[PDB]
Amino acid sequence: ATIGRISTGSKSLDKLLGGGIETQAITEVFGEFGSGKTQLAHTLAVMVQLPPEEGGLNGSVMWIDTENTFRPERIREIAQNRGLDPDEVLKHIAYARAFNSNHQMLLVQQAEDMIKELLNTDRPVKLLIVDSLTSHFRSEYIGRGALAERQQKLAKHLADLHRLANLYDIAVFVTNQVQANGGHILAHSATLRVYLRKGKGGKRIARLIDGEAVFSITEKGIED
Ligand SMILES: CCc1nnc(NCc2ccc3[nH]ccc3c2)s1
Numbered sequence: 657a658t659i660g661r662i663s664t665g666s667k668s669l670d671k672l673l674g675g676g677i678e679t680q681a682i683t684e685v686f687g688e689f690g691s692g693k694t695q696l697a698h699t700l701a702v703m704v705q706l707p708p709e710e711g712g713l714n715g716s717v718m719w720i721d722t723e724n725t726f727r728p729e730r731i732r733e734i735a736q737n738r739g740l741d742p743d744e745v746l747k748h749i750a751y752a753r754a755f756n757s758n759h760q761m762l763l764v765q766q767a768e769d770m771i772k773e774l775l776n777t778d779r780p781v782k783l784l785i786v787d788s789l790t791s792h793f794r795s796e797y798i799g800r801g802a803l804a805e806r807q808q809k810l811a812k813h814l815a816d817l818h819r820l821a822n823l824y825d826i827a828v829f830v831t832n833q834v835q836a837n838g839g840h841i842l843a844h845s846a847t848l849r850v851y852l853r854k855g856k857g858g859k860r861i862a863r864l865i866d867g868e869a870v871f872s873i874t875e876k877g878i879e880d
Pocket residue numbers: 718719720750751752753754763764766767
């Protein structure tokens with residue numbers, strides 16, 4: 657399959673990304689609590705449902721929530737202000753809450769069954785969100801003595817996600833909380849790392865890790 661791109665809603669961020677986030681790729685966004693990672697996730701869950709002329713892929717979405725932060729009301733707001741029908745947009749998001757890191761891993765296997773079911777339809781899965789990818793792994797494997805096993809489980813989880821992205825032509829989008837009092841970047845595992853932070857006057861700033869884009873959080877999700 658060719659590489660598809662999903663617009664983020666921000667022309668600034670799209671330019672930094674070369675057009676949007678890529679299918680057949682894992683995009684990892686990391687930053688402090690409150691930097692706006694979940695707002696970018698909510699916006700992408702709407703954008704992917706637009707036609708390609710508007711930066712979408714006419715796609716379905718699968719969302720794995722580890723922290724109870726998915727907000728259907730926010731999806732409705734973004735959809736309404738992107739000229740879509742909010743009921744239709746929500747109908748094409750499949751949502752699940754991961755109870756712990758082992759259940760989170762099983763949900764990715766279940767995701768593959770639904771991906772196969774929609775593969776040959778007019779609304780194939782094009783976006784798989786894991787928000788937040790590391791939180792259960794961090795809370796369940798505390799202490800230096802457990803770090804080796806934590807890394808083992810995380811590496812298998814990421815390999816599973818890599819496989820789905822490439823095999824089924826899906827954009828995988830994962831968030832990761834990293835700050836002074838806790839958090840670890842996903843080493844070299846993601847296809848692409850995006851650092852997100854707050855700036856003066858409520859602006860958000862994005863940089864590619866291994867220019868900068870600037871945008872706001874609005875009723876449209878994010879925008880310049
Ligand atoms: C934990 C209870 C649920 N079981 N399923 C749900 N919603 C549908 C569903 C099923 C599998 C999934 N894999 C990733 C997202 C996703 C969504 S909610």
